[PDB]
Design a protein around this ligand. Sequence first.
Ligand SMILES: *[C@H](C)[C@H]1/C(=C/c2[nH]c(/C=C3N=C(/C=C4\NC(=O)C(CC)=C4C)C(C)=C\3CCC(=O)O)c(CCC(=O)O)c2C)NC(=O)[C@@H]1C
Ligand SMILES: *[C@H](C)[C@H]1/C(=C/c2[nH]c(/C=C3N=C(/C=C4\NC(=O)C(CC)=C4C)C(C)=C\3CCC(=O)O)c(CCC(=O)O)c2C)NC(=O)[C@@H]1C
Ligand SMILES: *[C@H](C)[C@H]1/C(=C/c2[nH]c(/C=C3N=C(/C=C4\NC(=O)C(CC)=C4C)C(C)=C\3CCC(=O)O)c(CCC(=O)O)c2C)NC(=O)[C@@H]1C
Ligand SMILES: *[C@H](C)[C@H]1/C(=C/c2[nH]c(/C=C3N=C(/C=C4\NC(=O)C(CC)=C4C)C(C)=C\3CCC(=O)O)c(CCC(=O)O)c2C)NC(=O)[C@@H]1C
Ligand SMILES: *[C@H](C)[C@H]1/C(=C/c2[nH]c(/C=C3N=C(/C=C4\NC(=O)C(CC)=C4C)C(C)=C\3CCC(=O)O)c(CCC(=O)O)c2C)NC(=O)[C@@H]1C
Ligand SMILES: *[C@H](C)[C@H]1/C(=C/c2[nH]c(/C=C3N=C(/C=C4\NC(=O)C(CC)=C4C)C(C)=C\3CCC(=O)O)c(CCC(=O)O)c2C)NC(=O)[C@@H]1C
Ligand SMILES: *[C@H](C)[C@H]1/C(=C/c2[nH]c(/C=C3N=C(/C=C4\NC(=O)C(CC)=C4C)C(C)=C\3CCC(=O)O)c(CCC(=O)O)c2C)NC(=O)[C@@H]1C
Ligand SMILES: CCC1=C(C)/C(=C/C2=NC(=C\c3[nH]c(/C=C4\NC(=O)[C@H](C)[C@H]4CC)c(C)c3CCC(=O)O)/C(CCC(=O)O)=C2C)NC1=O
Lengths: 160, 161, 161, 67, 669, 169, 157, 157
Amino acid sequence: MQDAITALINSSDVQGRYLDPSSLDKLQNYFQSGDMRAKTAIAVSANAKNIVTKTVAKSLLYTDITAPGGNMYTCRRYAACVRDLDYFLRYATYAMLAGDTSILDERILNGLRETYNSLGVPIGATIRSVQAMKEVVTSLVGADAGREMGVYFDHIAAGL
Amino acid sequence: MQDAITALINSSDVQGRYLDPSSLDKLQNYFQSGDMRAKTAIAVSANAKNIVTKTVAKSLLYTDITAPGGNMYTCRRYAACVRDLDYFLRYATYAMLAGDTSILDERILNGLRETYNSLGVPIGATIRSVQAMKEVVTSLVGADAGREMGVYFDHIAAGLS
Amino acid sequence: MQDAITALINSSDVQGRYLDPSSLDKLQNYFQSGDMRAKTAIAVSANAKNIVTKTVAKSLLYTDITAPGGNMYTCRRYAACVRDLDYFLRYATYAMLAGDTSILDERILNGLRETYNSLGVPIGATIRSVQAMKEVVTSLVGADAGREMGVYFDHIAAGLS
Amino acid sequence: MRMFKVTACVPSQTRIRTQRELQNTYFTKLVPYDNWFREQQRIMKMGGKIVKVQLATGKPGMNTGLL
Amino acid sequence: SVKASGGSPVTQPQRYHTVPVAVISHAVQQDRCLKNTELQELADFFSSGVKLLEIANTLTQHADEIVLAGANRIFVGGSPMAYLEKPKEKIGLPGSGYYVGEDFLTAARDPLPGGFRFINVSRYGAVRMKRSMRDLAWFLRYITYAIVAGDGSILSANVRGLRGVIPEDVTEATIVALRAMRRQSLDYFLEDAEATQLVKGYFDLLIAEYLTDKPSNQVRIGVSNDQQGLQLPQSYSMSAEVRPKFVFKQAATLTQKQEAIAAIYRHVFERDVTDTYGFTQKAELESQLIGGNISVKEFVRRLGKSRLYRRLFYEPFTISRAIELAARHFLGRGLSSREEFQTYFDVMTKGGLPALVDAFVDSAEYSDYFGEETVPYLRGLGQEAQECRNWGPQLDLFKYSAPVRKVPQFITLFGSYQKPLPEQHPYGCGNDPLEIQFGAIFPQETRNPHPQPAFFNKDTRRILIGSGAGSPDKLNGNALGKVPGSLGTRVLKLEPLHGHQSPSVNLLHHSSPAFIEGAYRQVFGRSLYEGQRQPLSSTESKLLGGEISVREFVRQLAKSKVFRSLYWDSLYVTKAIEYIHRRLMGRPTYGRQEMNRYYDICATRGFYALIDAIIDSPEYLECFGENTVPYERYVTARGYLMRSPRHENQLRRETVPDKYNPRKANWAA
Amino acid sequence: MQDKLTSVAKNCDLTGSSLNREVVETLKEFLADGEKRVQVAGVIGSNAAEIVKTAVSLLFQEYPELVSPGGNAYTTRRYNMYVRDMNYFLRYCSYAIVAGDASVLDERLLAGLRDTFNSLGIPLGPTARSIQLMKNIVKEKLVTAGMTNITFVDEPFDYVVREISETEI
Amino acid sequence: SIVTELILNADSESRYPAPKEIQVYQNFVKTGEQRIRIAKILAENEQRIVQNGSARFWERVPNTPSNSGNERKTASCQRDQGWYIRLIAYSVLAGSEKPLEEIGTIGIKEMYNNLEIPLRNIVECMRCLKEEALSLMSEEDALEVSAYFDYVMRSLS
Amino acid sequence: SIVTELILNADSESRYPAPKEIQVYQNFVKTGEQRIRIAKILAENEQRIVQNGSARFWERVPNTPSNSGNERKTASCQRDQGWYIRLIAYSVLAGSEKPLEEIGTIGIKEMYNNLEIPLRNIVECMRCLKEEALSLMSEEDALEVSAYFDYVMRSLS
Ligand SMILES: *[C@H](C)[C@H]1/C(=C/c2[nH]c(/C=C3N=C(/C=C4\NC(=O)C(CC)=C4C)C(C)=C\3CCC(=O)O)c(CCC(=O)O)c2C)NC(=O)[C@@H]1C
Ligand SMILES: *[C@H](C)[C@H]1/C(=C/c2[nH]c(/C=C3N=C(/C=C4\NC(=O)C(CC)=C4C)C(C)=C\3CCC(=O)O)c(CCC(=O)O)c2C)NC(=O)[C@@H]1C
Ligand SMILES: *[C@H](C)[C@H]1/C(=C/c2[nH]c(/C=C3N=C(/C=C4\NC(=O)C(CC)=C4C)C(C)=C\3CCC(=O)O)c(CCC(=O)O)c2C)NC(=O)[C@@H]1C
Ligand SMILES: *[C@H](C)[C@H]1/C(=C/c2[nH]c(/C=C3N=C(/C=C4\NC(=O)C(CC)=C4C)C(C)=C\3CCC(=O)O)c(CCC(=O)O)c2C)NC(=O)[C@@H]1C
Ligand SMILES: *[C@H](C)[C@H]1/C(=C/c2[nH]c(/C=C3N=C(/C=C4\NC(=O)C(CC)=C4C)C(C)=C\3CCC(=O)O)c(CCC(=O)O)c2C)NC(=O)[C@@H]1C
Ligand SMILES: *[C@H](C)[C@H]1/C(=C/c2[nH]c(/C=C3N=C(/C=C4\NC(=O)C(CC)=C4C)C(C)=C\3CCC(=O)O)c(CCC(=O)O)c2C)NC(=O)[C@@H]1C
Ligand SMILES: *[C@H](C)[C@H]1/C(=C/c2[nH]c(/C=C3N=C(/C=C4\NC(=O)C(CC)=C4C)C(C)=C\3CCC(=O)O)c(CCC(=O)O)c2C)NC(=O)[C@@H]1C
Ligand SMILES: CCC1=C(C)/C(=C/C2=NC(=C\c3[nH]c(/C=C4\NC(=O)[C@H](C)[C@H]4CC)c(C)c3CCC(=O)O)/C(CCC(=O)O)=C2C)NC1=O
C-alpha cells in the first residue's frame, strides 16, 4: 500500500534532497483534486450496488456465459462474479483516494491471473465487465471524476 | 499469438455467428489506431538500444544490484539482464502493434516467474526496470502512444508478480 | 514391449526357473487363440476407416462437442479427434495381436490423461467414444473377437479414467 | 454433549518480552467435555488458576446419550 | 546444501505512515468501503494540503539557516557548515544525450542544560563533523517530509532507537541542536499560530522519540523445540501497517459485537461467506457469543467444526493442503517446519478434521496471541519477526488465491529443503514437457500452480535414462539403457544415391513415402494433415533425387512454417527451446550451459538460427550423421516412470520346519 | 537439527560399517576439541553485541554508500535491521560451533534465506562481507583470550558465505 | 490476420518489423473500412447465397448426401455452406486466409472423409456458392471473396 | 454517534486519537446547534409529516394492512411512522445512523415478517415520509436527514 505522497517522498528521499518544485506541484495537484476525489468516493460508496447491477445488465446478462455451461451459470457463480465486480469497484475507489496504483498491484493483480486461470473464469468477459463498470461510474460521477476513476479501472483491466 | 482482429473473430466464432455491431466498432477503432501504432513501432525500433540503455541507467545502475555480489554483477549477468530487457521491449512493441497482450502471455510470461526464482533474479528489481522502461518510452514517443505502450508494459509487470 | 509369450517368460525368469505346467498351458492357450487374433487384426485393418466413422457418428456427432465452442469444433480439432481415435484403434489392434496391454501403456496411455486435462479435451466424451468404438468393433468381428478387442478398449478407457 | 462452565484467570507470562497488547485474563466460559482436559492442562501450564468448574450440561455417571 | 526455493514473492514493506495510507489500510483490512468519518478525515487532510506544502516549502527555503542555527549552538572552534555535503546530481549518465557520438571533450566548454560542553570542530574530526552536519540536515528534511505526509511516523520509526546509534556522548548536544533548529523554524512563521503549532509538535515528537533509551526488541518465542525464536526492532513494527484488532466484550453494544463477529467470519472463512452459503446455524452460535456463554475461542472452534468450514476448506483439498490452510485460518500464520506438519498430520489421521481444529485452537500459541476475547488476525511481515524457512509459502498463503492452489506448498518445500537438487529442468518443473509421442504439453504457471524452483547453477548436468535405441554399430558405449516404448534398431536411415531410367520395382528397407512419413513423424511427432505437406514437396523431391541428405531434409522440415507454428509461435521461448531440442537431438538438454547457449542464439538471431545450431552441432553428427532421422535416446525419470505402470512382476512376496516341537515350554508337566 | 555425535551415530547404522576404526578416530578427534568449542561459544556469547557493532561499523566503513540516501542501510529502521540480522548470523554460527555440525545452519538460518533476501532486496555481497568481518573479530577475540587451535571457528562463517553468495565462476 | 503474420515473421528473425513490413501494416489498416463493408455484405446476403447455391448445386450434382431425402443431412449441408461463407467473411476482415485456414481448412479432408461426404461434391457446392456470392458484389470487392472460395476449393481437392 | 466511532477506530489500533480524528470530532461538535435545531423541527412537525406521508402512502399503496379498515392497524402504523421519525431525529443528533440501527433497524425484517406486514409497503411508506420531511427544511439540513431515511429503506430491503 502506497499513496502519491509516499511515492513523491520516496523519490525525493532516494536522492537525499528536499521536495523540489516539481514534486511540490504534483503534491499540490493531488491535494487540490482530493476534494472531488472524496466526493466521487462518497457517490460510489452510495451507488455501488446500482453500478454493479447496471454493469452486469449491459455487459454479462443474456449472453452465453449466463446460459448453462457458462461461467456465470448457477447462483453461486453469479454471486461470485457480482462479488468480483464489487471488489474491483471498491479497490478502484481505494486507488483513486490514494492517488496511486500500488493498492491494486498489491491486493488485486497479485494472484488474479492465477486465480482466474485455475478456476476457468474468462478473462475477456471480465475485461468487458470492468469496461462497462468504468462507463457507468463515469456517467454517474461526472466527466473528470469518471476519467480519474477510469485510470484505475484501466489499470485493473490491463493487469488481466 | 493473437491480435485484435483475431480476438474479435474468435469471440464471434465461438458463438458461430458473424461479428456483431459492437465487434465491428471495436475493429474500426483498431483500424483507426493502426497508424499511431505503426508510428510508435517505428520510433521504438529506431531507439531500441537507447531505450534499454536509459532504462538500465534509470533503474539499475549505481545500486546494490550492479555492485560486487549483486545479480547484475559480472559482465555476463549484466549482458543477460540487458538481453531480457531487449526481449521485453521487442515483445511490448509486438503487442502494441497487435493490439493484444496475447503474445506477451504466450511467449514472455508463461514460466518467467519460476525461471527467475530458479536463477535468483530479483523480480521486484525487474518490475521496477520495466516501469522505468515504460517511463523512458513515454518520454521518447509521447503521452498517448506512451500510454498505449505502457498498457503492455503494465501487463508485463503484472505478469512478473 | 511385452506380448503374452514374453510376459510368461519374464514371470518365469524373475523366479529363475523354466516355465511351469501352468505357464505352458497359458502359452498353449495363446498359441491356440493366435488364429482368431490374426483374423481379427485383418478385419480391423480392413475396416479401420469406417470403424472410426461409425464411432464418431454414434458418440460425438450432433452433440455440443461438434457445435461452435465445442472441443471438436473447427476442422483442425475434428481431425485431431479422429486422429486420436485412429491411434486408439491401431494400438488396440497391436495389443490384441500381442495378447498384452504393455504397448498401450508405454505408447498411448503414458500421460494421455494429463495431456487431455492440459488441452481441455473432455475425458468423459473420450471414454464414451472408446466404448462406442468397442461396440462397433464387436459388431464387425463378432462376439468372441469383439470381447477380446474390448479387453484392450476397456484398458484404454480405464487409462483415461 | 457434556459442557463444563469454567471460570479461570490466566495471566500472560511473556507479555513484557513480546510486548503484546494487554488482554483480559479473567474469563468464564462453556468448554466441551472433550476439550476440557486439554484446556485445563493448558491453563495449569500457563500458571493460571482454575477458580470454578461446574458440569453445566450433562449428568454425572451417564453411560449413554453423551452425544 | 539448501538448494530448494519457496519462491520470492514481491513484497513492499511500509517504511512510514501517511494519512491516506493509514485510512485506506484500515478500510482495506476490514473489507469495506470508507466510512463517513474516514472520508471526512481524508477530506480534511486534502483541504489542508496546500498549507502543509507552504509550511514545508518555507522550511526548505531556509534549510541552511535552520541547520546553521542548530550547528552554531553546539560547535566551536571552526565552521560547521563547511562539512555539510549537499546531494550531487548525476549528470551525463549513459543514454542521456549529454555526449553526442563518441566525442567527450567538447561537452565541457532556550537555556543550555547544566554543565553542557561544546564540541570543538577541529578535535572532533572531519568524519564526525560530516556525520553531525548530515544528521542535522537529515532531521530537517524528515521533518518537512512528516509535515507533508500529515503523520510523524517517518520521524518516530527512525529516531526511536537512534539514541546510542548516534554516540551517547553527544545525545545531549543533539537535543540542544534540535531545539536550536526548532527555535529558528518558529522564527519563520511568527504570524500563524497553526503552522507554528504543527512545527512545534513535530519537533517535540522528534525530541521525545529520540530520547527513548534502547527500546526493547519484540521477541517472538518459538512455540516448540522445532521452531526458532526471533526478534523484531520496534522501528519495523511502528513503520508497518496496523492490524485493526477486535476484542469481544459482552458489555459492548450489539453493533460492535456484530462487527467483531464479522471480523471472525472474515478471518476463519477468508471472507464473510456466511450469508452467501445460508449459514443459518450461525445465528445460534452468535447468540451463544453475544450472551457470553462462550468466548471468541470457542466460537472459532465451533466455526472450524461447522459444515461450512468443511465445505469450504476441507472438501476441495487434500489433507496436506487442508492442514496448511487451517494453519492460517486458526493461527493467522503458515506452518513453520515439517515437524509441525507431522504433528498436525498425525492429529488429523487419528481424529479427523474436528481433531485438527481442536489442536489448532487449544494450542498455547492461540491463547498467547488471541487469548479468549481477541478475534484471530493475520500475523506476518511487519507484525512480528518472520522466519526465512517458510517465507514464500506463508506470503503466498496470506494471499486471497491461497484456496485456489491445491498442491501443498509447505510440506513439499520442507521436504525438499533436506534433499539435493531435484530431477527437473534448471528453469523449473514448468520447463519439462510431457514425454509423449507428439505435442508440447507443459505445466502452465497460472493454472493449478505448483512451481518448485531450485537454485541450479550454470554447471549442473542432468541425469538422463538412456533408451537403448540406435543401430547396433552405434551402440556398446551406452547399451545398458532400456526404456519401454523404444524402437531399438528401427531407426530410419537412407543411404545416399549415386543415364538410364530405373527399374519399375526397386525396393529399399522403407519405400520413399514410408521413409518420408517416418521423417515427418519423428520431426513433428506425428503425421501432418493432408495439404500441410504442400510447402515441403520440393524439399522431398531433393531428398529423393539425392540432392540433399537426410540431415538437410530434417533441417528443412524443422524450418518450415508448420513446425514454427506448432512448436515456436505460441510457446514460451525456453519451453520451445527444450521441446525442439528433444525433438531434434532426441534428448533433453543437460543443463544451463546448453540452455543458455540456445537462448542466446534465439535472442540474437532467432528461430532459424536455433534450428541451424541444433542441427549443425557436433553431437548431432556423432549420433545421427547425415543419413539417419533422429530418434529418442534419453528420457527423464518421470518420463521413464510414466511408461512403466505395471509392477506385478516385482510383488512375488517374501518349508521344512527348522525346530522340532515348536512353541512349547521346557519341562511341561 | 543434529549435532556431530548424533549424525555420526546415525550414520553408523545407516552405512552398515557399524563402529569401525575410522568412526572411532573421527569421534575421538571431535571430542578432543569439545571443550574448545564450548569456550569459543562462551566468548561469542559474552561479546555478541560488541562483535556485531564492530562488524557493522567496519561494513559501513568499507561500504560508505550503504548509509547514504538510497542505500540499504539508509535510515535507523534499516540500520536496526542490519544489526538484528548480523546478530542472527552470529547466534546461529555459535550454535554450529557448539554442535560441530552445520545442520542447524541449514535448517534454521539458510533455508529460504535467499528467497527472503531477494524479496526484500537485501544485497548479498555486503551480507557476506559482514559475516566475514564478524568471523575476523571473533578470531581476534579468541586469540586475545589465549586460544590456539581455533581452525573450526572458521567453518560456520565461511560455510554460510558459500551458501548465500552467488556463483561467479 | 496479416498483422499476426507480420509480427511472427519479424519474431522468427528476432528483429523489429522492417520498413517494408510496416508499409504492409499501414496499407492493410488503411483499407479496414472496405473490408468491414465487404464482411457486412457477406453477412447480410448469406442466406440467399446459401439458398441459390444449394439450388444450383443440387441441379448440377443430384447424387449427393444432401438431397438423399434426409432432412438432417440437408440442414447440415446448408449449415456448412453458411459456416464457410462466415469463414470467408472472417478472412476478408483479417486481410489473410489465416482465419479460414485455421477454422475450416486444416484437416477439412480428414473431417469430411470421416463424415463420408464426397470431396468433389463439396468442391462443386463451393463453386456454386462462389458464383452466387460474386453475383451480389462488385468485382473489386469480390476479388478476395473469389480468392478465398478458390482457397477452400483447392484445400478440398 | 461520530464520537464513539472515532474512539473505537482509535481503540482498535491501540493508539491515542490521531490529529485528523480530533479535527473531525471538533468539526462535529461545532455543528451541534444545527443538529439540535434539525431534531427540533423534526419533533415539532412529526404529526403533520406522519399525516401527509400516510395519506400519500395510502394513495399509492391502497392494499396495505393499515388501509384495511382496521382502526388498531392504522393507529399502530402511524405510531411506527412517528417512531421512525423519532429515530431519524436521534440519528441526526448523534451524527451517525447508530441510534437508528440499534433501536429500529437491526432485526427490522424479522420483526415485520412476524407481524405479517409486507416489507415493500413499509419501504413505500418510508419513501413517502422522507419526501414529506425533506420539504419542511432547508436543502442543506436535508443532507443528513435524507441519508438516514435511506438507511431505513436499505435495511428493510
Ligand atoms: C420468475 C419466477 C421471477 C422473475 C425472474 C426473472 N429472472 C430474470 C433473469 C435472470 N434469471 C436468472 C436466473 C438464474 N441463473 C442461474 O444460474 C439460476 C440457477 C439455475 C437461476 C435461477 C438470471 C441469471 C437472469 C439474468 C438474465 C439471463 O438469464 O441472462 C428476469 C429478467 C431480469 C432483467 O432485468 O432482465 C426476471 C424478471 N421475476 C419475477 O418477478 C418472478 C418472481
Ligand atoms: C464476474 C465479473 C466474472 C466471474 C467471476 C468469478 N469469480 C469466481 C471466484 C473467485 N473470484 C475471486 C476473486 C477475488 N477475490 C478477492 O478477494 C479478490 C481481491 C479483492 C479477487 C480479485 C476469488 C478469490 C474466487 C474464488 C473464491 C470464490 O469462489 O469466491 C467465480 C466462481 C468460480 C468457481 O467456479 O468457483 C466466478 C464465476 N465469472 C464470469 O464468468 C464473470 C465474467
Ligand atoms: C575505464 C577503464 C573506462 C570507463 C569506465 C566507466 N565505467 C562506467 C560504469 C560502469 N562500469 C561497470 C563495470 C563492470 N561491472 C561488472 O560487473 C564488471 C566486471 C567485474 C565491470 C568491469 C558498470 C557495471 C558500470 C555501471 C555503473 C555501476 O557501477 O553501477 C562508466 C560510466 C559512468 C557514468 O555513470 O556515466 C564509465 C565511464 N570510462 C573510460 O573512459 C574508460 C575507457
Ligand atoms: C534484468 C532486467 C534483470 C536480470 C536478469 C537476468 N536474467 C538472466 C538470465 C536468464 N533470464 C532468462 C529469462 C527468460 N527466458 C525466456 O524464455 C524469456 C522470454 C523470452 C525470458 C525473459 C533466461 C532463460 C535466462 C538464462 C539463464 C542462464 O544463464 O542460463 C540473468 C543471468 C542469471 C545468471 O545466473 O547468470 C540475469 C542477471 N537480473 C537483474 O538483476 C535485473 C533486475
Ligand atoms: C477425440 C476422441 C476427442 C478429442 C481429441 C482431441 N485431441 C486433440 C489434440 C491432441 N491429442 C493429443 C493426444 C496424444 N498425444 C500422443 O502422444 C498420443 C499417443 C500417440 C495421443 C493420443 C495431443 C498431444 C494433442 C495436442 C495437439 C496435437 O495434435 O499435437 C484435439 C485438438 C485440441 C486443440 O486445442 O488443439 C482434440 C479435439 N476431443 C474431443 O472432444 C473428442 C472427445
Ligand atoms: C549398483 C551399485 C546398484 C545398481 C545400479 C543400477 N543402475 C542402473 C541404471 C542407471 N544408473 C544411472 C546412473 C547414472 N547415470 C549418470 O549419468 C550418472 C551421473 C554420472 C548416474 C549416477 C542411470 C541414469 C541409469 C539408467 C539407465 C542408463 O544406464 O541410462 C541399473 C539398471 C536399471 C534398469 O534396469 O534400467 C542398475 C541395476 N543396482 C543395484 O542393485 C546396485 C545396488
Ligand atoms: C454441404 C455443402 C455438403 C454436405 C455436408 C454435410 N455435413 C454434415 C455434417 C457435418 N458437417 C460438419 C461441418 C463442420 N464442422 C466444423 O467444425 C466445420 C468448420 C467450421 C465444419 C464445416 C460437422 C461437424 C458435421 C457433423 C454433424 C454436426 O452437426 O455436428 C452432413 C451430415 C452427415 C451425416 O452423417 O449425417 C452433411 C450431409 N453434404 C453434401 O453432400 C454437401 C456437398
Ligand atoms: C534466522 C534466519 C533469518 C534471517 C536471516 C532473517 C532475515 C530478515 N531480515 C529482514 C529484514 C531486513 N534485513 C536487512 C538488512 C540486512 N540483512 C542482513 O543479513 C545484512 C547484514 C543486511 C544487508 C547487507 C534490512 C535492511 C531489512 C529490512 C528490509 C525492509 O526495508 O523492509 C527480514 C524481514 C523483517 C522480519 O520479519 O524480520 C527478515 C525475515 N529472518 C530469519 O528468520
